[PDB]
Design a protein around this ligand. Sequence first.
Ligand SMILES: O=C(O)[C@H]1O[C@H](O)[C@H](O)[C@@H](O)[C@H]1O
Ligand SMILES: O=C(O)[C@H]1O[C@H](O)[C@H](O)[C@@H](O)[C@H]1O
Ligand SMILES: O=C(O)[C@H]1O[C@H](O)[C@H](O)[C@@H](O)[C@H]1O
Ligand SMILES: [Cl-]
Ligand SMILES: [Cl-]
Ligand SMILES: [Cl-]
Lengths: 559, 555, 554
Amino acid sequence: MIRTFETHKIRKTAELSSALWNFHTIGTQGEEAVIQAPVPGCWENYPDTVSYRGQASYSREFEAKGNIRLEFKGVSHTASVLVDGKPVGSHYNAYTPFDVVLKDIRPGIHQLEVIADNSFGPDSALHVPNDYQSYGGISRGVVLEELGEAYLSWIHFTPFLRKDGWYGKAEICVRNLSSGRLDGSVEVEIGKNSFAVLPIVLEGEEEKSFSTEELPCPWAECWSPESPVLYLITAVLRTADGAADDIIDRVGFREIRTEGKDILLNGRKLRIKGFCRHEDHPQFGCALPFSAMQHDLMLIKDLGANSIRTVHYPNDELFLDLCDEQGILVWEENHARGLSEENMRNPHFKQQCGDCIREMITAHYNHPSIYIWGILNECASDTEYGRECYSEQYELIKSLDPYRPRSSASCRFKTDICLGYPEVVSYNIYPKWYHDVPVEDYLDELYQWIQNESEGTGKPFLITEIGAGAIYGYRTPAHVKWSEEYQVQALKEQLQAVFSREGCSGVYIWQFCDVRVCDSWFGSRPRTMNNKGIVDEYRRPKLAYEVVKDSYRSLGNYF
Amino acid sequence: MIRTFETHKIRKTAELSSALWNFHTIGTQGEEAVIQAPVPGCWENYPDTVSYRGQASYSREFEAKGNIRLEFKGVSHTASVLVDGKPVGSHYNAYTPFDVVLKDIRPGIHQLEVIADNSFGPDSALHVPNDYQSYGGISRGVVLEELGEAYLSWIHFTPFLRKDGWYGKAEICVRNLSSGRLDGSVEVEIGKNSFAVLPIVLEGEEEKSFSTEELPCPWAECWSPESPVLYLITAVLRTADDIIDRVGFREIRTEGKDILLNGRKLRIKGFCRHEDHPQFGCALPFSAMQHDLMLIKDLGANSIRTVHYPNDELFLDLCDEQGILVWEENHARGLSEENMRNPHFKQQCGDCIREMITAHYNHPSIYIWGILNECASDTEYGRECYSEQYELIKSLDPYRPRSSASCRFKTDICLGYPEVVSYNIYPKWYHDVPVEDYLDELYQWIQNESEGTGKPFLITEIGAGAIYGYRTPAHVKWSEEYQVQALKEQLQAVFSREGCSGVYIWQFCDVRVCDSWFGSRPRTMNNKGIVDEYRRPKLAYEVVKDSYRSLGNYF
Amino acid sequence: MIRTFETHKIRKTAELSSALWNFHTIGTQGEEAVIQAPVPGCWENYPDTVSYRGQASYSREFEAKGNIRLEFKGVSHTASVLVDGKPVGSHYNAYTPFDVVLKDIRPGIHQLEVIADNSFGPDSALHVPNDYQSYGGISRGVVLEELGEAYLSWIHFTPFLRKDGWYGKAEICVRNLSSGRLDGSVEVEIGKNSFAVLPIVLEGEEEKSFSTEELPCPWAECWSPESPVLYLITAVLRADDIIDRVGFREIRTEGKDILLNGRKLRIKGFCRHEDHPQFGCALPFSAMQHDLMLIKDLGANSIRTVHYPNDELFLDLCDEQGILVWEENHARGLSEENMRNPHFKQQCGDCIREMITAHYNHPSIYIWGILNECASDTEYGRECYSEQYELIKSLDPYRPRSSASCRFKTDICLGYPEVVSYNIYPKWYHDVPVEDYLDELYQWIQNESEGTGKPFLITEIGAGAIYGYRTPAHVKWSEEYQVQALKEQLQAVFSREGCSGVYIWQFCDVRVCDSWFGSRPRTMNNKGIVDEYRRPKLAYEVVKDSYRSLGNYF
Ligand SMILES: O=C(O)[C@H]1O[C@H](O)[C@H](O)[C@@H](O)[C@H]1O
Ligand SMILES: O=C(O)[C@H]1O[C@H](O)[C@H](O)[C@@H](O)[C@H]1O
Ligand SMILES: O=C(O)[C@H]1O[C@H](O)[C@H](O)[C@@H](O)[C@H]1O
Ligand SMILES: [Cl-]
Ligand SMILES: [Cl-]
Ligand SMILES: [Cl-]
């Protein structure tokens, strides 16, 4: 399973994940026995490599002929792909998909091999020792596609809420694999309503994007938390062959807009009742199956949340599909957490950030659940060099998506110099956990400073992180910190304060569940875990579960 | 995902599971909220139905035209299927697959609804209050198939090991949905080798089976735990339809006290494993299953026993591919004589055996068929039921051996029937007898005073409780250190017991049970796992791994 | 520490406990290591004997001359005492005190050895495999007393509440260790008020008791939960003394009422075993008070001593804090056949005799219990209940008596006690609504039993919970289920017309016997409101809300 829906009926495709591959470590001075191992999966979950860091090899066979495409939804975190023993592609960043295109391969059985690598080092500026694990392995799915002469790379649909109703445009990208000129047509339908026909002329080996006008969609019903209506959009490449290729995605008609201090969904003023959620599970690493995803979402919905924040990297497209279908709002951000100014000066940092953003928005553009793009969680936005990166990455996002609001979760308390750029100002604060200041006092001081002393003034404002730690099981009448009883007190006051802060659009609690972290963080991280889950790593509700549930269920999605 | 491989390239099929359906409980007078629930799944894992027992409705839409088949891999435990508001199908038993066939439906969008029921009462003779959970919901997958005039119902392949090498016969069942006579052909290949072309004749609306002969397979490599080579077998109906399954070339038979796999004397290093998980109920995804199997391989085990019911075919697929030997039994546990006298018992055991063996016939990992775990094999009425079910199996699968797990310590009157004698025993957990002494007294009784004398012998259950996290220097029962003492002695005795073929540890993980069993079941769990319900290893995990890993697959 | 107050100022005494003795197990052929072990203590808390059941030896030396007395407050459960190598004394039962008296021993250093034994078998009718632990060792204190020619063996003070106010009578037992006739006086004071001077005549080696008359005590303030005023009572033999503490309080039943100083009492109680993961049944002063402070924090006003007499230092603390005590002889759940053990009646009568003689003066003890959940539905059992009730009345004619029954509508012994008491477990062992279960049982007692019209207590109600096991399914053994159960249970008992109150089963989790493992997760009884480490379970708040919303009287 790759999506909750079929993205192709014309194109010949086959999933090569949901299978056992042969797995062995490489580059050790140990026995490198070959085992059978699941794809998707992480090798920290296989008994023999439970604390392995480095390189390992995944291999299987496939049968194909002609032009083919190999799509990897995620490889943790550095990949080398080899077909029949020849290097054919490479990738960095565990959380975005990439592909390999191979022209006119001999028929029959072929050998596929993926070297996955989760080493830390100078070549890796995003995956570093951090307050979340960098797993290893083929953590999301793999798809083999047999292509014709030319194929559809992506389709991007934008709805528009005009005075007279719903409009929309579509942009399609076509890649000519043939050395000759290509003439054809792309016909677009949305939900079996006729939309557009884009005539196609492509030179040899050219990839080109084509756009429709802004067209009426009087038949469209809107997407919202209360009514998450989705339509299948289908684009068909027609050439002298015939219906040669297709691409199918899903869209929701919804408008996300900022106006003053208001985040507006379909004209209504939005209240965020959110959770920060990592892709982490003690059996599945970051390769969580559909059943584990939906189990998280039912707990999150049971807590009364309307939104998730993808800390701190793009998410599996299966998960975003599930959020589309259930009306869950998504803050999605590029892969970065707490990188210093010196980390951002790594020779690869800008290129790696650029590649993450490009793949994230190119692949995830159509998800109506995504309402905001985040960047550079808690990076050095108080420095001049830090500002330079923020500026570039913000404007990279505008060039890819000129319509969704942008933001970045900050912790430079009253020293941020990058608040002028984004549409939404966002802050991570931990009064009552890391600081013994009353939550109301701390939040008021920060908020006045943003309104009076920063270029963030007048913009909508979110607390993108607040919460407290607690070790499940540890309970004492002393209510000391790390006890479940103290987490209850902390969250009750924290949620009371954010929901009472005039000008604040809501909150993401840090965080949904407990998370495995890197070993170097053990000094401040009991159990080598981040312990601020409202549910523990096995999804057992802590005492604070009821406190969060009482808060979130007592408020609606709108102001 | 339904199988680890594609079962169709010609038949038009689409998975209707791996999706959210609309869900609500039924049996009340007001508004019940409609929630979006995962299929496959158990409603005990949905926050608002965590302890619900009764009926509930699952529903979605699909697009289809003409003759269609809806295949349900598992609905826990009683199902009613309605298409476009009309009841079209029924099933009992949570653990066997079943299908609905509809002729010439109008084109377009249709409404599908499943009423799932996990209630207890007189209608249900297999799902009772018991020492495992009877979940509710669409706990395995659902497949839409668009059919034509006729379709291949199943295909059964049987390998035969002769003095000159491998042989095999195939038997195909074809169903004619047309009221006229059908003429056609069925082309069978195994691993892209030409096997047979059978001409077919079916009268109107008839279902008939057709067999090849025993043909030579000089190309076949064998299947074993060391080398689980598999082949795809393909059957194409030309009249337009196909069916694809997987086979291994391997021989299971008993001879004297020996269980022989390809003529080698087999040693079972097993775990009893329930389909139970704290997040997934009995509806475990591919990822969870492989996680269990990797732990089980890490423990040195070479076999699993499917306590106490048939298993997901995706799980059997994974065992085939990895060389894991499988004891699969019909759904029954610990039924007394009076439970077995329920007017539905014989029908429901018979339906379970027929659907189990017909659907699973080809898995090379399945080496034995079990029946009626700890049922009333000490009574005449019980013996009557054992006899019927043993002969039902022989009619469906005349080659694999049969057994049953007994707890009728020196009182069983049914040991003459099976190919293998199996006993569940718990010395050093329920009785403070030394294991060697308890197992010796049992073993000499079967041999000197029972009709099971001279047959192969397994310990199908042995083990001890341990609540994860409870440890004391006193080594009291339920402490993890006591499970260590108990499992060492237990495994040492079984592997040293002359005539015993091996052992299934009770059990792999901790398992949720029914509330009525709470009094003897701490946490309303079975705590005899070597890993707890969250798959964390107890202290005894090391003891089992040192034992199993010191031993190979054969004597 | 033996009591919270000094019991002698004239008598020469020294505590031999609060020390390390030499300890080794016996019953083997080789060399057993000798270790320095604590007395008081249980060997199940010593690392090398954590599961030891059998005999063991405890020994130390002492210095003494002349007539001496060795008082042993508790040896679990069968004791043999040797001085200088010679068998001098025997006891059975872990929970009652006993003494050895030695006439004119040579002066100097002496060897004392105690052989303790916690074996189960035919010689033991009370200590059996059961739903609590039979520990081994010198689990309570030990006192050396150096005596003269006679000594005061005990003193019993009884208050009487009359129209004009408080009266009292005292009874004193003097033991003559001399072979000749003895003459003297006994001078008794209560709270430095003059009380009585009794002239004493004892023949040779005679033990005789002497009674004062009922005398006015117009200075006496009364004892109660609200005001636990205590007085020291002093009896001086003229050469020897004995001191004890009394409270002026009247316990009475009248109709369906239990009256404490005329006020209708409401019991808000806990069953509490003498059990601690570190200290076995040998809990120090500090651990007792920690239990008592949690018990007061929960809003309770009473404890029930399941299922045996308690340390006198614990009883002392209950006197000082106004905690009402139900004390019972040592027995739990013996069947008719267990009761037909040939030592059963001897060992019950010894327990009742040692219990009431030692504890008579504790004003906190308001009722005497017997034979918890024994065979009160059989004729042989009713024979035993009958005997033990009348023995109690012969030793204590004034406090009410009872027994905790589980013979739900089959008890034939309800005619005997002053108070009818039942242990019931609806919503734990039976899925009946508590009010319906309690109403069915109550109407039967009123309409169909000889217990009709008498005061009525629920002496056990509660539910299991393994600390730390929590789930949204609220299954049994989860802490969330124990919350639900106790809420309904306490709602029902406190609303049951005719019911005087409740003892929750039980305060804390308790180690039990290995044979009970099948129904006892962790080989523990998990029905505590705190766990064995005194950590509060979720249901702690439920009990607190219930008990703190109710006073001590109706
Ligand atoms: O302290 C914490 O737990 C958090 O601190 C920051 O807010 C960071 O963004 C998180 O990743 C997490 O580490
Ligand atoms: O006691 C136990 O745990 C077991 O007893 C029997 O052996 C039964 O077959 C098991 O299902 C389980 O109930
Ligand atoms: O079930 C229980 O825990 C209780 O049963 C009886 O009421 C008995 O008096 C208690 O000692 C305890 O065993
Ligand atoms: Cl933390
Ligand atoms: Cl168990
Ligand atoms: Cl218990």
